[PDB]
Design a protein around this ligand. Structure first.
Ligand SMILES: O=C(O)C(=O)N(Cc1cccc(Cl)c1)Cc1ccc(S(=O)(=O)NCCC(c2ccccc2)c2ccccc2)s1
Ligand SMILES: O=C(O)C(=O)N(Cc1cccc(Cl)c1)Cc1ccc(S(=O)(=O)NCCC(c2ccccc2)c2ccccc2)s1
Length: 265
């Protein structure tokens, strides 16, 4: 099951078999969705898209190329305010990942540090709870939803895993679906490489192209159970339970119980 023009696409029920098929989907960005990809979204009955990319990402790579009749909910994560102080932490963390030195071990140690520390902050970050609130509300209402970001692996992974835990699925099932993102690493690598080739002059700055590709092609493209567990520990420590977290995000147990009624076989 492919989604032409996009990658890392699956019906979450493909691995989480307790779920009804056709309710909750996940993918990469839909910036390059082609005719066949659009026909697929329609065939599957998907009515709503949750676009988790920051507004900066959407501006630079474009809106989802969805067919008519599909509402795209823009659900930026992080949701950044005219405020350089707001974006600074994100820019600084990315710069450190890139510019921390040449060995694969050091490059991948930096990727592990970056990813882990960002996941730890996922629950408390502006935009994550609004994203989760909308996705849960749409799902509880019986609407088939496709949730995505850029890679569809971390931000998307976090939102999906919380939805699955909310409807009562076990850890091994949630983690299995989460790790499925690793099957798309080579494709992600190619997408990012093509992006590097266009944002940089490959003739006049080939050293920068080479340096950058070396930090955006290996360990940093995967997911690991420890990443998700770090977000999940934040939820535990600060909110005391997933239910406590969902309530702070404005979602009641009654809405959760309705979503469970809808999503489970
Ligand atoms: O350009 C876009 O497209 C976009 O909005 N991005 C870039 C991006 C999107 C998806 C995946 C990756 Cl790895 C990067 C989101 C960003 C991530 C980090 C930033 S930043 O504020 O730290 N600016 C540095 C971007 C950086 C870069 C962009 C694309 C690919 C590799 C590196 C960069 C751009 C130009 C010169 C040097 C570094 S902006
Ligand atoms: O969620 C995904 O799946 C996903 O698309 N990514 C982007 C990515 C893919 C491959 C390699 C890298 Cl380094 C990043 C993985 C993420 C890394 C970090 C995050 S984050 O939610 O903690 N911060 C995301 C906003 C950020 C950013 C966008 C694209 C790529 C890198 C970082 C950002 C937004 C605006 C200015 C600077 C940085 S999400």
């Amino acid at each position: 099951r492919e989604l032409p023009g996009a990658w890392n696409f699956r019906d979450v029920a493909d691995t989480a078999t307790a779920l009804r098929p056709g309710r909750l989907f996940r993918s990469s960005e839909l910036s390059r969705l082609d005719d066949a990809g659009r026909a697929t979204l329609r065939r599957l009955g998907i009515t709503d898209v949750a676009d988790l990319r920051s507004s900066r990402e959407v501006a630079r790579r474009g809106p989802g190329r969805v067919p008519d009749g599909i509402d795209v909910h823009l659900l930026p994560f992080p949701d950044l305010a005219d405020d350089a102080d707001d974006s600074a932490p994100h820019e600084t963390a990315f710069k450190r990942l890139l510019t921390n030195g040449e060995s694969s071990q050091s490059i991948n140690d930096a990727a592990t540090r970056y990813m882990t520390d960002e996941y730890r902050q996922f629950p408390t970050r502006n935009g994550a709870q609004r994203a989760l609130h909308r996705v849960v509300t749409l799902l509880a209402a019986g609407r088939p939803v496709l949730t995505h970001c850029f890679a569809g692996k971390d931000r998307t992974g976090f939102v999906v895993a919380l939805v699955l835990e909310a409807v009562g699925l076990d850890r091994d099932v949630i983690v299995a679906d989460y790790l499925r993102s690793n099957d798309s690493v080579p494709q992600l690598r190619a997408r990012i490489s093509e992006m590097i080739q266009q944002r940089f002059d490959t003739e006049l700055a080939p050293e920068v192209v080479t340096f950058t590709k070396a930090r955006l092609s290996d360990g940093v493209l995967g997911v690991r159970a420890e990443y998700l567990a770090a977000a999940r520990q934040t939820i535990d420590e600060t909110y005391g339970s997933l239910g406590g977290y969902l309530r702070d995000a404005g979602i009641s147990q009654a809405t959760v119980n309705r979503m469970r009624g809808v999503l489970l076989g």
